[PDB]
Symmetry: C5
Subunit: 205 residues, 5 copies
């Protein structure tokens, strides 16, 4: 406990918190989705409710340490409030996202951070054809709300959504689930915009 | 990181926070709406739910800096809690507004602030005739709750609501969406009152 | 900005906050209601939902200042959290009251405070007869939760509820709306209890 | 104001807050209920919703003062957050309790505290027979969550629930409402467990 | 009070809070469930709502004291916010868990902590066959969100869920309720992961 108390004190009480990335010091954020369930489909409002884990990874030099100086500690768990976290948001939500898991991150000695919030999301989705064999496709983009591709570079490790934890007795069957990194440019702005498009093809089980 | 940490420290930890505008030092707030969806229409209570982005822009001398003194930083992102924000509100909401995005603003070296909260709004709207070709018109005024025209001047860049992000498979089709700055004079009071009237004409797709 | 920053610092950072009134130093609170809408009526639970502005006015010697000493500032806007506010409550609510507006007050150099929260209230009301020409009458009392008339004296400027902002396409038509100051004494206790009785007669439009 | 500011400073800023009772220094908490309304009955989930005032009284030596030393102040009102409050809870609630009133307590010079929160409670109750003349009986136990009878001596003043404020046009009529205290010892443990069983017999009006 | 004030000050104001367990200093957390009611079953979304008490026990050397040095105090009650608590979560919830009880723990002089939060949980469960004699089986895993078996060792005192407080007039009858410790391994990671699988077999009463 003494070595970990010392490490946390040196990392969090000595210097001000990381102020976020800039064009000169960009940050790469890796996103991955683990879809657990399609909990609700509302055909009268065109809202669909998903339960998923959103894996977020990034690396900060300010979070690095030599394990030899701290009783061979290679990683620790800490409240996500103690650290800077990226402002990754769903771009077409209809309700505030509901957090289903403790807000705790894992920090590794190389400065790597892994934060996996479990969430319930209501987003814009026309479910017409969900009761058919072909099913229905719905998509929701995720990205930084305030940082462009010049400050936050969004990435995925795979374009395949993790369906290994998908509820087997769900009302809905997943035909396909992909997470695709997209780089967009708008007429307004010279900076690129990055999002991860979560595309889910599903039908009634 | 060091230059941004220094900038934020100089802007936020040296002087007290901006106390808001006065008649002697008025502030101009530019409002713009990006309508995403008409998520719900309730004909039994006369409530309509909107999902939109509300772009807010203002400029403070106290937020200015010389980029040359701070490693050529021309702008940064910071929690909206670190800065003063205008008390812009819907004058005919029926439920507290639901924030759908991170509460983060972009501050530019010229003292400009851009704050774009995504919101879900429930407001007073009689949807009689939504199921017709003519559709229905509904309006909601936005403005400062406590500041008159003498302290906060409200403006728009365009009278046209941005409909380029409007949900393509929405239950409702937008016939027209305008955002108009209105000035109101009362016999009682010498001070003018300013609002932005969001007028949306819509029908069932 | 500098003069207002100085004023706020002198009023709020020099002395402890106003500890509320006492029998020796009573406070008069003026109440006024502006009814915007009867949003929902529930005949299965006997609950009615109102949307209104509740104007609250009081005066504190501790909030007084000479405008000449502060660059001729005669009033300012401040977060209601910076000041003491009366504990005015609805005595027959069925749900926690929902705040629809920014929590900001206007302080005048004579020590006057004006606080106008917009609220959504669910209260006990049998709506039987709302669908008739005669309509239905419903009442809700407002007053201090913990202070008697010896500490907080409630007053009204008028017995007429402001209906000039009442939603013209509401499901309900207002036949009459009054706000009356009422006094009561209990056998135990000598102190009077004050409430403002909001009586609304309404029917379906 | 000055004398009350001085009193509050002496009571709350000089010594640490009361750490709660112990076996060596037990505390008597007097509990009583004022039933306002049976708002809802749900026969599909077996949940009943009550609106009531829960009167809590206790006395602390650390909250005592000589009125002569403080401008003859015999009592004051303060935020329930400034003082220790007992952890009295419903043992069979189905939803978090909703607070309908300001969280303010009355402290008397003898160290007496009176705290009367208004609340909405959903609790386990089978309402089968509510639509009959006989009605239905439902019960909810209240007590300390973590303190035994050795630390918190939970008491009542009367076994009769105050029905003098019960909503006259409620959907439900009260046939009887009692608050019976119970002291129990289990074979495991030497300490008594105390609870108050709020028993309400009611039917449709 | 003085001895307890002194004890709390020595335990909580002298050293930094316990930073959580590590591989070198693991922690055993014992979990136990007391099922109170199956409040709701939703066959359209496949969600079931449970009301239960979750007993959590763990032991910290940093929470030890000699009762002889503190007026023979052998245990005390304190806000769960004053101490470190394990991040035990339901792995298949569909809504944020609702806390129904005060967040207070019991600390014993041997460093033992007992924390029993009452909760309402919505979780993934297909209730098809609940209206039959055979009933339906539903399961929910609980475990640490961020810690492995190397840091938090989860244990049970019994595999039998406590049904002695189960609501007698519930819509649902419990056929069986077990809580089983399970050790899992993931392809990513060499460390074992522990969960407690709450398996409830139930039917309509
Ligand atoms: C966040 C944290 C834990 C989980 C777990 C899922 C399965 N195990 C743990 C299995 C587990 C996943 C996992 C994902 C990335 C890296 C390491 C990981 N270990 C218990 C909780 C889910 C989301
Ligand atoms: C309001 C409007 C769009 C957004 C974005 C939605 C898609 N992108 C990039 C699209 C985008 C245009 C744009 C115009 C002005 C300022 C920021 C902007 N971001 C990232 C955030 C956030 C808030
Ligand atoms: C609380 C509740 C509602 C408001 C206003 C409602 C409509 N207007 C301006 C309408 C308005 C005239 C007027 C005349 C004298 C004093 C205050 C006044 N407000 C802007 C906001 C402000 C604060
Ligand atoms: C708890 C319970 C009710 C209230 C009130 C609701 C109606 N009154 C009546 C207030 C009131 C009666 C009374 C009778 C005997 C002794 C003290 C009393 N206070 C003012 C506030 C406030 C706090
Ligand atoms: C967590 C879970 C339940 C409770 C209680 C439920 C019922 N009682 C009596 C609680 C109670 C019996 C009992 C019997 C033997 C040993 C210890 C015991 N505690 C008071 C609160 C408190 C905290």
């Amino acid at each position: 406990q003494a070595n970990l108390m010392r490490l946390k004190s040196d990392l969090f009480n000595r210097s001000p918190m990381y102020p976020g990335p800039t064009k000169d010091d960009p940050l790469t954020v890796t996103l991955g989705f683990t879809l657990q369930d399609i909990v609700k489909v509302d055909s009268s409002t065109n809202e669909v409710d998903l339960v998923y884990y959103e894996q977020q990874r990034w690396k900060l030099n300010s979070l690095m340490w030599d394990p030899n100086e701290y009783g061979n500690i290679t990683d620790f768990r800490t409240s996500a409030a103690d650290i800077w976290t990226p402002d990754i948001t769903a771009y077409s939500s209809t309700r505030p996202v509901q957090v289903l898991s403790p807000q705790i991150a894992v920090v590794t000695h190389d400065g790597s951070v892994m934060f996996i919030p479990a969430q319930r999301l209501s987003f814009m989705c026309d479910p017409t054809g969900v009761d058919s064999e072909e099913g229905v496709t719905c998509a929701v983009k995720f990205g930084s709300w305030v940082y462009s591709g010049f400050e936050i570079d969004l990435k995925t490790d795979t374009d395949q959504v993790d369906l290994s934890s998908y509820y087997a007795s769900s009302k809905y069957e997943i035909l396909s689930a992909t997470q695709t990194r997209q780089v967009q440019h708008y007429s307004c702005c010279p900076e690129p915009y990055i999002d991860v498009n979560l595309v889910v093809k599903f039908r009634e089980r």
